[PDB]
Design a protein around this ligand. Structure first.
Ligand code: NA
Length: 130
């Protein structure tokens, strides 16, 4: 599923992402925008280390979910990576919350640092009624 901007913003607020571990809703929107373009079925294989990024938040199989083919991987979210490819993003949101519970927080995703950090991210939630 490819979410429309405000549709996703309202869904994320309802799932309690606004201010989770100090991360504003607009930051989550910026992250989803640059990681997958709000697309839940997005997959990206990383040839360099044999891991794959899954879903709307492009969650990596080395640390967060299990796909069985990633070497030396763990499954901190305790989910099959398949769960991160559904149209319903409840599991993807629960796992994203798990990721930011680690010290790096939102910095765990390099795209956030490059495209969102220190930027005016208001545009991502403007006019969505959230
Ligand atoms: Na894994």
């Amino acid at each position: 599923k490819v979410f429309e901007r405000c549709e996703l913003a309202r869904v994320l607020k309802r799932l309690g992402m606004d201010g989770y571990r100090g991360i504003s809703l607009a930051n989550w929107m910026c992250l989803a925008k640059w990681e997958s373009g709000y697309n839940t079925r997005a997959t990206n294989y990383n040839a360099g280390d044999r891991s794959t990024d899954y879903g709307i938040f492009q969650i990596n199989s080395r640390y967060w979910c299990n796909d069985g083919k990633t070497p030396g991987a763990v499954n901190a979210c305790h989910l099959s990576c398949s769960a991160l490819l559904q149209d319903n993003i409840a599991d993807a949101v629960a796992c994203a919350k798990r990721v930011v519970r680690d010290p790096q927080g939102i910095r765990a995703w390099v795209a956030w640092r490059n495209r969102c950090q220190n930027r005016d991210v208001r545009q991502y939630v403007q006019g969505c009624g959230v």
